[PDB]
Enzyme design. Sequence first.
Site, mmCIF file in Angstrom:
data_model
loop_
_atom_site.group_PDB
_atom_site.id
_atom_site.type_symbol
_atom_site.label_atom_id
_atom_site.label_comp_id
_atom_site.label_asym_id
_atom_site.label_seq_id
_atom_site.Cartn_x
_atom_site.Cartn_y
_atom_site.Cartn_z
ATOM 1 N N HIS A 61 88.570 56.288 22.035
ATOM 2 C CA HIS A 61 87.591 57.575 22.155
ATOM 3 C C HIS A 61 88.105 57.290 19.903
ATOM 4 O O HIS A 61 86.546 58.333 19.554
ATOM 5 C CB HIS A 61 88.231 58.795 22.158
ATOM 6 C CG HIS A 61 87.908 58.051 23.563
ATOM 7 N ND1 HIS A 61 87.234 58.535 24.681
ATOM 8 C CD2 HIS A 61 89.850 58.617 24.833
ATOM 9 C CE1 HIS A 61 87.479 58.236 26.166
ATOM 10 N NE2 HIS A 61 88.939 58.109 26.383
ATOM 11 N N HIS A 91 93.664 61.177 13.297
ATOM 12 C CA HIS A 91 92.248 60.589 14.197
ATOM 13 C C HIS A 91 91.666 60.777 12.987
ATOM 14 O O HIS A 91 91.337 61.581 12.909
ATOM 15 C CB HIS A 91 92.177 60.563 15.738
ATOM 16 C CG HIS A 91 91.689 62.102 15.900
ATOM 17 N ND1 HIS A 91 93.279 63.157 16.792
ATOM 18 C CD2 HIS A 91 90.511 62.277 15.573
ATOM 19 C CE1 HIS A 91 92.232 64.115 16.687
ATOM 20 N NE2 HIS A 91 90.926 63.714 16.543
ATOM 21 N N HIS A 93 86.974 61.602 13.913
ATOM 22 C CA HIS A 93 85.637 61.165 14.268
ATOM 23 C C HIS A 93 84.226 61.017 13.058
ATOM 24 O O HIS A 93 84.120 60.944 12.236
ATOM 25 C CB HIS A 93 85.280 61.730 14.634
ATOM 26 C CG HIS A 93 85.836 62.833 15.463
ATOM 27 N ND1 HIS A 93 86.041 63.246 16.901
ATOM 28 C CD2 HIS A 93 87.225 63.651 15.269
ATOM 29 C CE1 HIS A 93 87.313 64.093 17.741
ATOM 30 N NE2 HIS A 93 87.978 64.194 16.332
ATOM 31 N N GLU A 103 82.892 66.695 13.194
ATOM 32 C CA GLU A 103 82.271 67.661 14.771
ATOM 33 C C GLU A 103 81.820 69.291 14.550
ATOM 34 O O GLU A 103 80.539 69.245 14.469
ATOM 35 C CB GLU A 103 83.688 67.778 15.005
ATOM 36 C CG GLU A 103 83.612 66.151 15.843
ATOM 37 C CD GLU A 103 84.961 66.200 16.943
ATOM 38 O OE1 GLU A 103 85.657 66.638 16.885
ATOM 39 O OE2 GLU A 103 84.854 65.401 18.323
ATOM 40 N N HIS A 116 91.305 64.810 11.386
ATOM 41 C CA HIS A 116 91.724 65.477 12.297
ATOM 42 C C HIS A 116 93.130 65.358 12.708
ATOM 43 O O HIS A 116 93.958 63.912 13.070
ATOM 44 C CB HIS A 116 91.932 66.090 14.149
ATOM 45 C CG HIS A 116 90.418 66.600 13.887
ATOM 46 N ND1 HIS A 116 89.364 66.465 15.011
ATOM 47 C CD2 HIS A 116 89.210 67.219 13.019
ATOM 48 C CE1 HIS A 116 88.387 66.874 15.318
ATOM 49 N NE2 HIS A 116 88.590 66.956 13.673
ATOM 50 N N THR A 195 88.409 69.085 20.821
ATOM 51 C CA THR A 195 86.912 68.343 21.034
ATOM 52 C C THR A 195 86.931 67.189 21.819
ATOM 53 O O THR A 195 85.922 67.215 21.943
ATOM 54 C CB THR A 195 86.768 68.342 19.617
ATOM 55 O OG1 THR A 195 87.039 67.420 18.791
ATOM 56 C CG2 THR A 195 86.583 69.284 18.255
HETATM 57 ZN ZN LIG Z 1 89.539 65.020 16.727
#
Ligand SMILES: [Zn+2]
Length: 257
Positions: A61, A91, A93, A103, A116, A195
Amino acid sequence: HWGYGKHNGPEHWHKDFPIAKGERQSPVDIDTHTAKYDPSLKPLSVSYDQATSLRILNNGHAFNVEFDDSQDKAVLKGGPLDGTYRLIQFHFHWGSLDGQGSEHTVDKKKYAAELHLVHWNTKYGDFGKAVQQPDGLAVLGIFLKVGSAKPGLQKVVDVLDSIKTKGKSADFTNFDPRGLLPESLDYWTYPGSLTTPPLLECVTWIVLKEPISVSSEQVLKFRKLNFNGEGEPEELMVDNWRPAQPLKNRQIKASFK
Ligand SMILES: [Zn+2]
């Protein structure tokens, strides 16, 4: 299994994870004019000098840079928080294009990516217990815009070819996450959730106002990762972001005027 495709993406998650439609879901749009300055908010305390990174993992992911959280070595305190929160992993996104990827949004603006830094409240003893509590996690969220390179990100970028596919990991010691922070620690804060599934409502979100700049070349290398495992059809790891969720009965507070 859940993911970010058309048939298993964010609009499907509620079927396996009904909390997806809950009262404190993340991310959210940050309406800068409606967020209220709270003079009782303290400055953030980010104490990363003794941080011990261990490993970098493609989990299908995102990629997680994991830290030794068996001692108070890299901790977040102050700000809206009570107590001490230990860094466990960070990590990102990111998008398929520079125009999307974050996000959280700011007045509906999407950044190219969002970092994050995940911390858990030491009063609960471990991460798995912490995620069961409304004040279990504190996530420091930092926006990425495309412009000049971030020198402190390059060591991450350069190991990604070794963890191209889901389930691959690589040693990743001696990485200093202070190199990923912007100059200012001004922030917005609100109560929210993970999330990704299981979408637990256990997070105090602390989102920095100042983005960091990364180069086009740096983010392009994020986009060469794969969601799939080795020897499976290649699906580029892009657009691994959940869109903004309803704010509901929440107020976003600002640490700054
Ligand atoms: Zn995250």
